[PDB]
Design a protein around this nucleic acid. Structure first.
Ligand SMILES: Nc1ccn([C@H]2C[C@H](O)[C@@H](COP(=O)(O)OP(=O)(O)OP(=O)(O)O)O2)c(=O)n1
Ligand SMILES: [Ca+2]
Ligand SMILES: [Ca+2]
Length: 411
DNA sequence: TGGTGACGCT
DNA sequence: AGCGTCAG
């Protein structure tokens, strides 16, 4: 009944902002946001601290409008390195966090600021030793128990007490051990980086990711098999990982529902007929809290790319500047690629050029030398047929986006 | 009116 | 190989 594994999702709280605040102490505990390119409307916001989220500041929001919402909003700038954003600060901080996380159990790099962790073996290893010694509530100073109890911190402690009181090879005891380990993990992350995070502990990846978002920030939530019916009864379908797009929308359309629990009243063959073999099976299992997607041992990315958008009147309409932006992208890609070669002992072998006209086109070619000029020229070569232009020195129709991606990595 | 990444389907 | 989807 999907209680074999113990899986945690650790995601950092307002991560880019925590990075900038670790760099600039004037920004700590203040309503502030991280911005991209001041010129257009003060810059698009990409990261909002919680003190600023209280005012209503959101991602994908021009900084100038956010200042209308919150006048006291402080802004920290993303580094700009070749006429384009440079995110190496946050990638290095991410690696900082991922290594600490790797010190406890096998992790799956899920994004720049979160990882899944498979804690089965560590829970067993701690359960064999420590003997029958109980679980002090002092071992979980930030854990919530979803559905308990049946002063926000008073609520928290009452639920934790109800859980610990009502407690061999029991899945709930496993979850408790893993939650203690995650408390440890997170205290280590905070002591060694200054960064704060939330976490979800459960039996699979999706339940862990939902639990991590139940109690943000700087808190962790345990979700047991038993909390699942109650939790899913009012859980909007779109909050589940991969049900936030078109598939999750049509599930609601066809089945005429609203929450996860209502998927239980359907047979597995029904949902397979509705959404496919692999999707019907997965939904039938998911609505009952069961998922088998494993925690893959992969801390390192599989692709390395740079894109630049050229919206509106700024799209590229000369070959003289398509050349130049391809060269800029190849430059940053090459710096990152040499760092990857010397840090991770592996080489990219295939280059992917992606372009858009007013990712409408993607081609691939050979990646043989970590050379910016070679790669820019080969990417150009690979895209020329697209230039409908009859005039030799213009480019029509203009390009809205350029994308360069090194992939197919060999040791 | 941004800049990335994993994965599925054919 | 190229496109479509999903999300941090
Ligand atoms: N559309 C997005 C989503 C994320 N990010 C970057 C900046 C974020 O700091 C980081 C991770 O984003 P999350 O969605 O995980 O959320 P935050 O880390 O900002 O905070 P929280 O998880 O507390 O909401 O990735 C981004 O630039 N654009
Ligand atoms: Ca986060
Ligand atoms: Ca996240």
């Amino acid at each position: 009944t999907g209680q074999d594994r113990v899986v945690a999702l650790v995601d950092m709280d307002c991560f880019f902002v925590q990075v900038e605040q670790r760099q600039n102490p004037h920004l700590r505990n203040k309503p502030c946001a991280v911005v991209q390119y001041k010129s257009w409307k003060g810059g698009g916001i990409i990261a909002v601290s919680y003190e600023a989220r209280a005012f209503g500041v959101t991602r994908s929001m021009w900084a100038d409008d956010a200042k209308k919402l919150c006048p006291d909003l402080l802004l920290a700038q993303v580094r700009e390195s070749r006429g384009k954003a440079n995110l190496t600060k946050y990638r290095e901080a991410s690696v900082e966090v991922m290594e600490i996380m790797s010190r406890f159990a096998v992790i799956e790099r899920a994004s720049i600021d979160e990882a899944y962790v498979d804690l089965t073996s560590a829970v067993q290893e701690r359960l064999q030793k420590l003997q029958g010694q109980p679980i002090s509530a002092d071992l979980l100073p930030s854990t919530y128990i979803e559905g308990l109890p049946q002063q926000k911190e008073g609520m928290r402690k009452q639920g934790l007490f109800q859980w610990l009181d009502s407690l061999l090879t029991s899945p709930d005891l496993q979850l408790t051990v893993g939650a203690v380990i995650v408390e440890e993990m997170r205290a280590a992350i905070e002591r060694e980086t200054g960064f704060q995070c939330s976490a979800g502990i459960s039996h699979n990846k999706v339940l862990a990711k939902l639990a991590c978002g139940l109690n943000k920030p700087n808190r962790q939530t345990l979700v047991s098999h038993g909390s699942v019916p109650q939790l899913f009864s009012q859980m909007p379908i779109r909050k589940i990982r991969s049900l936030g797009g078109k598939l999750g929308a049509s599930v609601i359309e066809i089945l005429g529902i609203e929450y996860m629990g209502e998927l239980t009243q359907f047979t597995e063959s029904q949902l397979q007929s509705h959404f496919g073999e692999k999707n019907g099976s997965w939904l039938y299992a998911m609505c009952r809290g069961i998922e088998h997607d494993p925690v893959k041992p992969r801390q390192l990315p599989k692709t390395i790319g740079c894109s630049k958008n050229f919206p509106g009147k700024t799209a590229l309409a000369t070959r003289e500047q398509v050349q130049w932006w391809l060269l800029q992208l190849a430059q940053e890609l090459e710096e990152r690629l040499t760092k990857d070669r010397n840090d991770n002992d592996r080489v990219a072998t295939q280059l992917v050029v992606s372009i858009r006209v007013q990712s409408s086109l993607r081609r691939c070619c050979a990646l043989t030398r970590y050379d910016a000029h070679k790669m820019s020229h080969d990417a150009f070569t690979v895209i020329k047929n697209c230039n409908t232009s009859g005039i030799q020195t213009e480019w029509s129709p203009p390009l809205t986006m350029l994308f360069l991606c090194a992939t197919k990595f060999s040791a």
